[PDB]
Amino acid sequence: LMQFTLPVRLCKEIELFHFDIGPFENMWPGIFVYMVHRSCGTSCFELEKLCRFIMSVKKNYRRVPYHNWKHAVTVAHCMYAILQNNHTLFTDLERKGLLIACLCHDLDHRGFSNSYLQKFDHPLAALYSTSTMEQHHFSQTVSILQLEGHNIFSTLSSSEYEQVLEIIRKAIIATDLALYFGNRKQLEEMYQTGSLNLNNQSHRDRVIGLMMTACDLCSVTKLWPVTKLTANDIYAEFWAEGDEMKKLGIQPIPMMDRDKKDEVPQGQLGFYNAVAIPCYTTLTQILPPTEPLLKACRDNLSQWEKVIRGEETATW
Numbered sequence: 001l002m003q004f005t006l007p008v009r010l011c012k013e014i015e016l017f018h019f020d021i022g023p024f025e026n027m028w029p030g031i032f033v034y035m036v037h038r039s040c041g042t043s044c045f046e047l048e049k050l051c052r053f054i055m056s057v058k059k060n061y062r063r064v065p066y067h068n069w070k071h072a073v074t075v076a077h078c079m080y081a082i083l084q085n086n087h088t089l090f091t092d093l094e095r096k097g098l099l100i101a102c103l104c105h106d107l108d109h110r111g112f113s114n115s116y117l118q119k120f121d122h123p124l125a126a127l128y129s130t131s132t133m134e135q136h137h138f139s140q141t142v143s144i145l146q147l148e149g150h151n152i153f154s155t156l157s158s159s160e161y162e163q164v165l166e167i168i169r170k171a172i173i174a175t176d177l178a179l180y181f182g183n184r185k186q187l188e189e190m191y192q193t194g195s196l197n198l199n200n201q202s203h204r205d206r207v208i209g210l211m212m213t214a215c216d217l218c219s220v221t222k223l224w225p226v227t228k229l230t231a232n233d234i235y236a237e238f239w240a241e242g243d244e245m246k247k248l249g250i251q252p253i254p255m256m257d258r259d260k261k262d263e264v265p266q267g268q269l270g271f272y273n274a275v276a277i278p279c280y281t282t283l284t285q286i287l288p289p290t291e292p293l294l295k296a297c298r299d300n301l302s303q304w305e306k307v308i309r310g311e312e313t314a315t316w
């Protein structure tokens, strides 16, 4: 066999939740295949079809500051770390589906929220009334899977193919943060009443949904220099959207107004308290080995507090 291998530092550090995939774009396909081979198996996919699939997915991500090809592979790496540290808990189809779902979860993102597409009256908003961009990301995934020589699931039965596409659809839709609040609340109530049941498919769907949020937000679980620099890319998009809202004659929300840049540290503190900490808290309760994501999130919360107190300086 031809096994994928990484340099010694990457081989060790890729197993860490806080791993950064680095600035060499040409290494990310190899990093992804390496993670598929270890988390799924060398027989899960035909290498030729998987490589062709990866390069078509890359081509359908756009040159935007944050929702780009690097984000796709970064979210996949976080899923890899969750799967490898919980390897008894997931099925063969979930291992085949979830790294692919992560790679594809923001396909053809233009750096604009569902709200902006609604206000602009974009054709996508007419086609998909809720989770507009996420329904688009899934449609783009199906289009690529149906290209000649791109059926990476060709050895699955019709019923198994339908199952894995359902895992991918639900996982991509779960990255709509509007749906996270309800999903985490349901999971919190289920865990605390001891009703949570990983044999229940509707429960598995919710746990996978929370895993997808955890992976999607994972910049907050990196080492501080990575967290701080990624925040610059996130705001580059938010502020471009705020400019476009102002062009429509609509006041943007504070996080999208570039004139409010001095309030970013307090905005981050608000986001960590309201979204990130609860997300990784609930995930650790369900999957204790994901603890390092929560620890790293708490460490970054403390860094943003230091910035607010003027002990740290967050420059753009």
Ligand SMILES: CNCCN(C)C(=O)c1cnn(C)c1C(=O)Nc1ccn2cc(-c3ccccc3)nc2c1
Pocket: 175, 177, 216, 217, 218, 219, 220, 231, 234, 254, 255, 256, 260, 261, 263, 264, 266, 267, 268, 270, 271
């Ligand atoms: C997942 N899709 C949803 C979009 N998205 C990618 C995220 O929300 C996301 C993902 N990772 N991170 C780190 C974030 C993030 O930073 N979010 C927020 C969330 C709320 N805010 C409020 C203020 C703020 C700024 C200035 C003034 C007042 C308020 N700033 C923020 C920032």
Ligand SMILES: [Mg+2]
Pocket: 105, 106, 133, 175, 176
């Ligand atoms: Mg998205």
Ligand SMILES: [Zn+2]
Pocket: 071, 075, 105, 106, 175, 216
């Ligand atoms: Zn994303």
